[PDB]
Symmetry: D2
């Protein structure tokens, strides 16, 4: 029977939020990193993980100039970051909303190894998720993020892990859209190992087809949904160099064969590549003549912050240089999402 | 492992053929009909079904003037129609190829009831089909057609029937593309009964999602594929009249949420509706203010040839006259494909 | 490739534990009541919900004479009951192990309604479950229990809910077997509403087929699992009464068409049945002259502990009468699980 | 809703037929030979493939003595053999019926390579099968046969081929049961290549689980079906040789974890192994102490006729020696079916 999944007011609200997030010239600042994960970046400088250090890093990232206001349409934060404040008497969500961006959140809870598989893993965080998402929404959160890590080996991935991750993302999106939060789905494939482009493209098509079949199964309202797939690049140890245009055509082909046009927008993740390479790769993505009926934007955590963290270096006086270089990189990526980036 | 479904050269060949079939301003003339099925249309006039009568009907539909040349990009015929000849020393495939259109064939073999259902059907003709498609290809047919009839009751279609039909269509498309023939997939939902628009839209989304999941499963090369879905219309007994714009938006919403942009084109059929209603409905389809990354085109057998057959009336002296009314309506369709039809 | 799911010694240990739990001449005592579920049972007497009342009730059930020692092969508890102790300062798991039974835990976390589906719910409790199961294992629990509730209406259950619950059970069993805990699976179909025996039998076959397909998908080691299905009975308000032999043959037919013989044992649940009715029904189950290769046993909650609950009545001087009636019911059920139950 | 797949009377008829075919001590004589298979077997002697030679071969096999009456409960024949007759004015169906056996038929139509797969194949013959099965049933046949070939390699079989074959077999069984014909499902895995026993066991479990899930999907009445799986043996060029008891344990484990007890009986196929080895392997399979609730029986075409074929020598005068050797091996296999064979 025809059973509705969302009342029309919810459809309109989610569509408006998703359009505001992936509006042209905008993007996602993936500043969210777990209290343990960001410790690696903090010690990369030569320092140690500290609560005030993390808060000041996120303050540096989220207190930039007007130059990035029409360039960062969404910022994703952690659970503890949402309950913090900056040196202005305002919390971080208030600053993000004032700057024009949309406050995000990472509602994942890490990965866990599976049984009877080589290196397949599944993510957790679905239990008690409706109340958590309601709490996030009442504190101010219009879109969440859930990621699944999938690795390509000599016989990986199996259909079991792919379907498991698809079901997990379907349930995640269902809960988020019921609570009133735009779900971001990231079937990320690790660009690690030694393989060519065709294998990665084929795996990406399979994963995207399974994910969208699962989404259609769970009565997901695809119009209020954002997609964050990987980029079609070879393995890290691959020696066969591929041109940027080949990467662009392979990626647009992979997205065109599986993703329905009703998806509001398709962001991207760097995947172990330098900032210049990722930015020019997405610029090539936005330079393909094929029909792309969805807004293509960027979402980089490590590609927009490595320069910022090395310039900041743990000192409270190098704030401006790190902010300036981060703004320069953000401007480069904002020009990259329209095909207007030249080196 | 990555296994190539098709070689690149035949990928380009099927892509070119599919682009030529659904080229802008063109169309599909569903001149195909079973030798037994055409008997009903012939006796509707009040005349005796005869082989010469069938051949002359096909001739009349397939010997029109230049006014329909940039309007019929493809004509579908039956098994015997290819082995026929016209009154000028030219077979029907030769006439169609010279006129500009592409010869099509119907490789279905009727339906058969299932077991333990509320009434469901699946089509046959998959076995011993590679050699038949090769024969049709060297006869002069560059694309085929397969249809699946699905009916909406109170709990139909079930998952079993939908998945079985999707598998049948996937095998059909795989065989056709292996032999070098562009497959046309027709998940026909019958507009019969008493139901509203939302139920038909939901069923259409489910069916298209299952069909495209099956196609991705069978390594189908979607770029060389044509889709022929139904129209989102209520049953003939429905007492709630819906405006044309509502039908257009519902249909474009159904097609946008499931069909990837890589599909070369999406045709349509009328079923139980008059010629003017279907033509203005497709005009509304092409006048909807939403982005559609595929060429929308028409394909009507009964909603475009009824006037021609009634004007012919079983008499050989109305040849041109029956053609004229056939031409004019076709021109209307050539105007509906671009949204330029105003009755 | 052929990736192992469990080391051989783990397989042997799980097989031994599962055989011990469901060995002939044993049973399962379902005390899997949290501090909230037991509140309704406690107030049904006319008293108040108290922690000491809960502990004394579970002491009354779990401290009994030898008459029930070869009758209860397993007692299921909740999180707090493991960390409790009797009057003589001995923990409940120690008492259960001394009496000969096997300690079990309920690792569910309630239900949550789904989106866009009528009257369907899915259970939670999978997140962070490996560490919780390890804690339960080193506490003294050797087998867990998971329940998924499914109701029967007009279009229920849908394929979505059935597959979702099957995947949840598969992940549950995978985690439990990886940690070293025998999983008990309860796809419980509510005998509520207005329907006949055939519909319930058909739904039960579908649910069990989906569950075992999911279990085979997740590399589950079926020899170390316990199945706790419903009993094939009509709805609560059915207009036609069925004989006990018909219920027995329907249940054994449903179990024989889906359950592989490698399943260690199949228990049951009351589903709104009195003590005498449930006892004679399971006696009929074991009286059906069909080849059943799995050990059939009982697992009763309210159908076996209601008389003891009312006899205890909240007073501490009625311990012996409630104990005697509970022992009588346990003896009746232990005689019923062999076909030798004399009314 | 609950829609019946078969009426109760024909349910009883199919159950009786299936029980008669797999009755204890009986067996299946695979006397079907394709025009290429029989060509190879007759050229093994060196004689010319002739219609009279084929008819005399089948007459030799199907008319031996009363000593095979309690040993051969079913004979599978080719399409042409059903319309044949012996030299005594009596057709083969009547001879088989009088002798006590049941006449079979092979309703397959060969294999066809798939697209985008290493070495996967799917069988054809489903189109126009209701009428063919009705003709076969009215001719005298009571149970059909369908052989599926699956190969084990580095990544084979894929899930696509497994699901394809499962759906093909489900449709086959549904059609046969609707026409009143007991289907025999043979998910045969080729014992060719180089692999160990565990991989073959794992593949067999996967294939059997998928096949029975498909059968449950298509409303198949499992009580009127027979199963003919591939005996769990390593590859042809396996480096490590395994004991017969290990083979029997692996086979009973594979069949017990997937096959519901409602299956009437499970036969077996030789699979490129010597005749004495096949006989002793089936004896060991019947020597396993594990509880098997289905009747195990033999079905060999090459293993029961190679000695008879070579003794016949393509001569009219060497009839009796070949007949005696064939009846001796029939007696040996009948003894092995009950676990009572000792060389």
């Amino acid at each position: 029977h025809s059973h509705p999944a969302l009342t029309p007011e919810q459809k309109k609200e989610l569509s408006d939020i998703a359009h505001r997030i992936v509006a042209p010239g905008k993007g996602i600042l993936a500043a969210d990193e777990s209290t343990g994960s960001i410790a690696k970046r903090l010690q990369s400088i030569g320092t140690e993980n500290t609560e005030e250090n993390r808060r000041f890093y996120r303050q540096l990232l989220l207190t930039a100039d007007d130059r990035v206001n029409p360039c960062i349409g969404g910022v994703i934060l952690f659970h503890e970051t949402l309950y913090q404040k900056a040196d202005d008497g305002r919390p971080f969500p208030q600053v993000i909303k004032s700057k024009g961006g949309v406050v995000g959140i990472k509602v994942d809870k890490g990965v866990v190894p599976l049984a009877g598989t080589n290196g397949e893993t599944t993510t957790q965080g679905l239990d008690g998720l409706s109340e958590r998402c309601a709490q996030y929404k009442k504190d101010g959160a219009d879109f969440a993020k859930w990621r699944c890590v999938l690795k390509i080996g000599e016989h990986t991935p199996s259909a079991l892990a792919i379907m498991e991750n698809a079901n997990v993302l379907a349930r995640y999106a269902s809960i988020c859209q019921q609570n009133g939060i735009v779900p971001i789905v990231e079937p990320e494939i690790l660009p690690d190992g030694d393989h060519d482009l065709k294998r990665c493209q084929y795996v990406t098509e399979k994963v995207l087809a399974a994910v969208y079949k699962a989404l259609s199964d769970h009565h997901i309202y695809l119009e209020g949904t954002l997609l964050k797939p990987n980029m079609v690049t070879p393995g890290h140890a691959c020696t066969q160099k591929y041109s940027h245009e080949e990467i662009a055509m392979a990626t647009v082909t992979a997205l065109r064969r599986t993703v329905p046009p009703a998806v509001t927008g398709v962001t991207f993740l760097s995947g172990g590549q330098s900032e210049e390479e990722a930015s020019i790769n997405l610029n090539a993505i936005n330079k393909c003549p094929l029909l792309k009926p969805w807004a293509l934007t960027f979402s980089y955590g490590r590609a927009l912050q490595a320069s910022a963290l090395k310039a900041w270096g743990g000192k409270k006086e190098n704030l401006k240089a790190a902010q300036e270089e981060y703004v320069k990189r953000a401007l480069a990526n904002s020009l990259a999402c329209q095909g207007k980036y030249t080196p």
